[model samples]
Target: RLKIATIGGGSSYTPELVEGLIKRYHELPVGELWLVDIPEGKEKLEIVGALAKRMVEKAGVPIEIHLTLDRRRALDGADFVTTQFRVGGLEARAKDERIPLKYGVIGQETNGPGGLFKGLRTIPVILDIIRDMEELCPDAWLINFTNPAGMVTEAVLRYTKQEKVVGLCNVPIGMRMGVAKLLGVDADRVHIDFAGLNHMVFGLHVYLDGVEVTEKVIDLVAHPLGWEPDFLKGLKVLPCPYHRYYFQTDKMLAEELEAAKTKGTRAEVVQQLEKELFELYKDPRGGAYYSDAACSLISSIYNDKRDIQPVNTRNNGAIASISAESAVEVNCVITKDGPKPIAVGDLPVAVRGLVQQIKSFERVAAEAAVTGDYQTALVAMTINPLVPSDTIAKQILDEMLEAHKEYLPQFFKQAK
Candidate 1:
């Protein structure tokens, strides 16, 4: 019997994950599903957990659903652990988004100064989970879907003895799906050679089956609907949507300021969305939403299917210029042995500087998270492309450090 544990099982998306597992029940040896959350989230766990159980039973798949507040208990005997936890919850995310914007920088949960703080708050919690996994389920594979995933995965791989963790995000898959729709081809048939760090990446080549169709995909992606045609044609590579945070900082900030007038921060928008989503989940009739990249990764690993997927893992010569310890988003052949990143050439000179800068920021940020060095944190923020001034960076760092003091015990311990 294979035990699969989800650390933040109380999330509104757990049912979708459970639904995917049920659909692949025959192929994957998933006998038990462990839902772990804190005491405050018990109501959500019960509500969502019950709905998940009903969905499995209706499908006639014999899978046991277990709900618990004990993380160690959940980790015990588990073959796979999927972590999508938010340490300070959406409330903290709201702060992360709002605080940096006050300093005139982009305040996204997974980018800019906001992401650095989010990484600081999250790395400790994730490392604790790793400690438990080390003692309780040494052999279990960790599939992390945490925000600021690239940095978090770097922290784990560099700081822990555990080597089985694989960080995941849906952006690459979402990009592929959008490309597939435009090309009139199945998403699985479309392949891309993506290189860079998470969120900070470029899709260099697009292929349909065994043939290369780089220019064709570039043409569609270069249009205003994707990227500016001039910029795309000039770079000779397609930048992910997150690039707007860097490439068009002034425009993104202006739009963000305008949107803030009505929608408030993205975290606030998600809070409202979560409330509505959970309300829908409360009704037993509610159906499951599909999360393609996450589910595909789990199923492939469980069945030992050596499928190629874009995931966040160690560089290891995947990009000749990037150091091996850096966490990069690249094409990896996923199998039971784990993900092996594909070797690739260097990024174009046009965008390599940006990628290299972000990698440096991520490495410094990871070190700050692990060591709790406030000076290192300041340096990370100072060097970040999004942070406009070192003076503002220090101010943002101080305010964020104080704002999240309860969650950041590592930083707080320096006084003692």
Candidate 2:
């Protein structure tokens, strides 16, 4: 019997996963379900607690449930650590997204400027948790579901002596399923090969029952409604680059700041419409899609969503065995020997170059996590896509140094 621990146990996504485990692994003996989160983040914890109680009462199983805001005590004997932590929380991300709009850039969760800032704020806390986990459960595997996943996951593996850790993202899975829908194929029958950082991954190829589906997605994004000037396809000269492209798009930035500009276009109108839609989904009533409530679709979509796709794994595994240091989505197999990511074909030179840049950031971030070295972290930030030329990189670096004075003093003191 393996003891499962969720670092953010009170999270909505935890219950969905637990339910899935119970439903799927009914025959297997399971131990305690430890829910650990910050004490101040209690209401959500209570709801999750109630959900666990309800599940136990309904299933008539003798499942042991324990909830605590203290992680050190909760992580004492865990066999697995599932984490999703957002330091500074949603309120901060709102500022993250809005402020960049004013600067003619779209700052997002895992993109250029905004994503780097987010990483700086969040990774320190994550590393601190890892220290606790290392002390408490040296053998446990850390399954991270945090934003900037690849960076955080790499940091954990590289900085510490921790043997087992992996990052998880649903984007590749979502893209595979989305491709299946576009091509009129059952998701199970579709096979996909893709690689890239968390949100910006691109599928190299896909097959639906021996028939290729790449052309279909290309066509879908090429259509009028399939893309916007600020959308993924519009941001680059290439096809759909996923959400990352949208962040650096000139058109999107212009549209977002149209009120400041004298003339607003249809793109601005659409942008407002999209924001309202997100706001609507963000409401408490729309708990399933956008709310922070536990077990919501927004929360569970990544882990429990059904789809067939290849994902990143260790070594020369996944998509032609490139052996890229950072995690890239490739095919994987789950067997008695745990999960093994399979190699696909090969990545194009350009794609590999981009992946390399991303990997550099991942390594630096991991080092930052390990030593609490601020200079390396700043360098990682300097290399971000939105660094705009080296001169701009220095300027942005300085601004951040000043802006985060209170929050991060180590970066300034140690940064060369």
Candidate 3:
């Protein structure tokens, strides 16, 4: 009784999505799964769509698979819309990474100047999708796995009228698993209190079997247990990896620069992964865990499972420190009614300012994406913690703008 449309179905993530759909077919009951992508991505779309069909056939689900270049057709009558789109592909991300490091900054797909540019390219497209969804399936829930997800979801919540949207990221789950391993237990026995922005989330509390284990896990990290530098030593709250960009700035930059020399940037390696996987597909996955996570979300909502899933949603007093209107990634109670944010009184004091600053950057970047103003785009880049000064921010902003000109028509106003 459900129709789901996934934009950017050309991504290697689709086969995994199909696999997830099969696993949940008993409850989710997806009647039609539409795969949509642009003309340039037709080949990848075709291949991935073929793989999805094969996966669904092998699973013997009665669901219909529809592949298309037309987005409107896909969105019509859809119950849910999932986005896994990459605006300019890995080439643009290579620029997002490589360009910043040229001026002595660490480059990542969804942080700092790199993330700002990604948001600039990505936000407009998503807003456009919202427009289509508004016109067609006005009741559809949007599950976004698009990068710079924090910014994208923030833009969606603020800039659009649609309220049935949630942003997905698996980093918190990975952290749960990691902490589980540290506790010498399975992930199911471990529960964490995650609160903050998207990739910038922190584990405020840890519980094992309904008992507090927060200090115990901290001791594991600090007690000479293979984690060098103990970056988590001071905060005592668990930190997501992206916190390295802020906490261990020079060290993270050093690592990124060094890796760029040997392995290329993250996107370059992902580009290699994409090429190999698409040539015939993979034991070399896109990690596409994104799809797996999405399936869980959809199933939880469909069944009113009321599971606690960490997702990017409205602050809504979730973090008393941040604006209720802003989007923050925190634990939520997922139900047929949608995600209800669990209150987190405030962020941990140590990481508080950094989170607030990043939130500010996201607000500005979202505006720049919607308005397409060059000067505002520069402000978004300049305020980012990863970019050192206004001067280098401008330099990186100019270089990245020139590199990603095709995707960023909003900012350039067609100045070629």
Candidate 4:
């Protein structure tokens, strides 16, 4: 009889889970489910409530259902707290996505400039929920289904005594399943050894039965689709704008122009490209797409594998070479023992380097989120690859600091 509380119940995920779980509830022995969301999203929450009734009427399960905007009330005496919160809705996410493109940087959700904005926005909200759980139900597991998950997990682990929290995302699992599909093999038949920060890695080796399939996957990555656009199965090469780097050196040259303020053809070409990207980025569905992708992958992983891997990759003493503290994806057991991360191993040099870069910035970002240390946050942003120079980084960080002021806690004070 697990009292499961889910935050972000207004998302499409709610209905999808409701339908599936209604069909599968006999397999899962959940006793009660409390849906939690913000008042701003309460209208959609009602839609879910209606669907819950439909599931109950049709499936005739004895499960209890409750929906409300109050997180603490929902979290009280819960066995699990499932969360999928975004501080601002899709409109603000679009702004975050497009604004980074304006700087001639590739706008990536949960990466670079976009993630930086979201990290600032989401940290306080998530931490507040964590505080509530501490006060209301001290024993419940915090199952976070949020973006920039690694950063959030790091913050919670470092700043609070909430040891039961585990951040969740679907990227790594999706990548593995996509690999299996590409090879025309049963996904279960594939065994992999790989490790790095979430979404910033490549499988070092994959085995079908006992045979290595690394080159085959690499071949797929190098070919026509090369995992770009990623519609087929939600995967892209590490260091996105992957196609740009592979097929468009000229685009990089053009992007480089913004920093150098180059002249003649290079400058002109870059200006045009930048303008085109701005138009493309104006599509409001950009950040939300990847967020949805992450969510979808969570379902795919659990449905297909009956097991899920941990997304917030870290060193819980898995491998000697990997830092135990850095966030990376690894196999996990989501069973009676709870989510136990099963280490995959060290990542390749290129992947590791990029992950290290992201993780370094994430640590500082977490620190800033924990203490509301504006200077530290500024420094973290300055260190990200999207910033062409410290001058520009500082400038943008100042702007973001101002833009994100509303999300910051009014009572935030420097940690002693």
Compare candidates 2 and 3 on lDDT and give the better one. 3
lDDT of 3 by residue, 38-76 (tens): 998999988888878777787788789999999999999
- lDDT of candidate 3 at residue 263, scale 0 to 100: 92
Clashes of 1: 0
| Candidate 3 displacement at residue 161 in angstroms | 0.3
TM-score of each: 0.95, 0.76, 0.96, 0.77
Best by lDDT: 3
Query: If both were scored by lDDT, which would come out higher, candidate 2 or candidate 4?
Result: 4
The window of 10 residues in a row where model 2 has the poorest summed lDDT is 286-295
Which scores greater on TM-score, model 1 or model 2? Answer: 1
lDDT of 3: 0.88
TM-score of 1: 0.95
lDDT of each: 0.85, 0.57, 0.88, 0.62
- For every candidate in turn, the CA RMSD to the true structure comes to 2.4, 6.7, 2.0, 8.2
**How far off is residue 86 in model 3, in Å?**
0.5
Q: Which one wins on TM-score? A: 3
Tell me how candidate 4 scores on lDDT: 0.62
